[PDB]
A paper describes a structure:
H. pylori Csd1 and Csd2 belong to the M23B metallopeptidase family and may act as the d,d-endopeptidase to cleave the 4→3 cross-links. The overall structures of Csd1125–312 and Csd2121–308 monomers are similar to each other, consisting of a helical domain and a LytM domain. The Csd1 LytM domain contains a catalytic site with a Zn2+ ion, which is coordinated by three conserved ligands and two water molecules, whereas Csd2 has a degenerate LytM domain with incomplete metal ligands and no metal ion is bound.
Only the Csd1125–312-Csd2121–308 complex was crystallized in the monoclinic P21 space group. We have solved the structure of this complex using two different sets of data collected from two different crystals at 2.27 and 2.35 Å resolutions, respectively (Csd1-Csd2 dimer I and Csd1-Csd2 dimer II in Table 1). In both heterodimer models, two copies of the heterodimer (AB dimer and CD dimer) are present in the asymmetric unit, with each heterodimer consisting of Csd1125–312 (chain A or C) and Csd2121–308 (chain B or D) in a 1:1 molar ratio. The four Csd1125–312 monomers in two heterodimer models I and II show three different modes of metal-coordination in the LytM domain: the canonical metal-coordination (for both chains C in heterodimer models I and II) and two other non-canonical modes of metal-coordination (i.e., non-canonical coordination A for chain A of heterodimer model I and non-canonical coordination B for chain A of heterodimer model II). The Zn2+ ion is penta-coordinated in slightly distorted trigonal bipyramidal geometry with the expected three ligands (His169 and Asp173 of the HxxxD motif and His252 of the HxH motif) and two water molecules. In the non-canonical coordination A, the Zn2+ ion has a high B-factor of 82.4 Å2, possibly due to partial occupancy. We modeled this electron density as the C-terminal tail sequence HVDKDA of Csd2121–308, encompassing residues 299–304.
Numbering used by the authors:
A (entry chain A): 129 to 153, 165 to 299
B (entry chain B): 123 to 304
């Protein structure tokens, strides 16, 4: 109900590039997700939060790197960017423009590198990218290592 | 001026209020020997002078990222909670810890009991509120509530509060029964 949309503002979901949503309505790393795309494709936050780090640099081969910190231990990483349009400490919405895709850092060809983390631990991004309003059980089905019981109950009591 | 839903949501997700209910005084930690650095004058949150085994409560929703128990040096027994939007709270010198690392936390949930463990200088709760690891004025967060909503908005050197409430407005919007039909 109201539950669904609320949860999807705070917990990362969907593709962070538009043309991968339009299609979905893409190869795995070890670990994260690489999405090949031309330079300067817009990159959107998959949930609301704070920009934990907008780092213009080599960042171990990530190139230009944005870390978004989400509620309840979730983080998203957006790497190989051409430009970053947010600063460290800035608050962003779900769907907000944060950067433009590129080929910076250690990259064989232009693409977005996307990770979802829970407490600095990588988790399968495909479980969150294919999570959406229609396919709503999917992240609970496919990602059992998260204690969704505790989390959903807490998120509900916000709504009140 | 903000709506009530923004205010309420903010007070669930960002540290506010009193994490200990019984105390006889509140004192900046700057005025005693710092628990780690062992000297005065370090900008480091606050101390509640309080009796041993007073319950300590989480000042906002979050997740526990770090716990020390069975410690008698420095901060002593402690809990650190990671909150939404880059904030964290720390609770130190505890006699007992009730929560485990990686557990989700609700505002007002019991997390421990105050003590005198570590370089405490006596029975007290030591308390810090941080934003992306940077030390803030905790007293502004203590005094913050629905009827006195300005108090924390005064700590604005590192924090863009208008930006935060615009993001919060995008969340509370959804309680209206809508939208997005092409
Ligand atoms: Zn890559």
């Amino acid at each position: 109900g109201l539950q669904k949309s609320f949860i999807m503002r705070l917990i990362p979901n969907d593709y962070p590039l538009e043309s991968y949503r339009r299609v979905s309505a893409v190869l795995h790393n070890h670990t994260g997700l690489d999405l090949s795309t031309a330079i300067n494709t817009p990159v959107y936050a998959s949930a609301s939060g704070v920009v934990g780090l907008a780092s213009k640099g080599w960042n171990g081969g990530y190139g230009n790197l944005i870390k978004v910190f989400h509620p309840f231990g979730f983080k998203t990483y957006y790497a190989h960017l051409n430009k970053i349009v947010v600063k460290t400490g800035e608050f962003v919405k779900k769907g907000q423009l944060i950067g433009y895709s590129g080929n910076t850092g250690m990259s064989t060809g232009p693409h977005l590198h996307y990770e979802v983390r829970f407490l600095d631990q990588p988790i399968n991004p495909m479980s969150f990218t294919k999570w959406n309003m229609k396919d709503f059980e999917e992240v609970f089905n496919k990602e059992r290592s998260i204690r969704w019981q505790s989390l959903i109950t807490i998120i509900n009591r916000l709504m009140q | 001026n903000l709506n009530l839903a923004q205010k309420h949501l903010a007070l669930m997700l960002i540290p506010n209020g009193m994490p200990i209910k019984t105390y006889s005084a509140i004192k900046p930690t700057k005025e005693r020997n710092h628990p780690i650095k062992k000297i005065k004058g370090v900008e480091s949150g606050i101390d509640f002078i309080a009796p041993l085994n007073t319950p300590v409560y989480a000042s906002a929703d979050g997740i526990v990222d770090f716990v020390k128990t069975n410690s008698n040096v420095g901060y002593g027994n402690l809990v650190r909670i990671e909150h939404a939007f880059g904030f964290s709270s720390i609770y130190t010198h505890l006699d007992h810890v009730n929560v485990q690392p990686k557990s989700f936390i609700q505002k007002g949930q019991l997390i421990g009991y105050s003590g005198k463990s570590g370089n405490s200088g006596g029975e007290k709760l030591h308390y810090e509120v941080r934003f992306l690891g940077k030390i803030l004025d905790a007293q502004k967060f203590l005094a913050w509530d629905l009827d006195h909503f300005q108090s924390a908005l005064e700590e604005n050197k590192f924090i863009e509060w208008k930006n935060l409430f615009w993001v919060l407005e995008d969340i509370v919007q959804l309680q209206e029964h809508v939208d997005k039909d092409a």
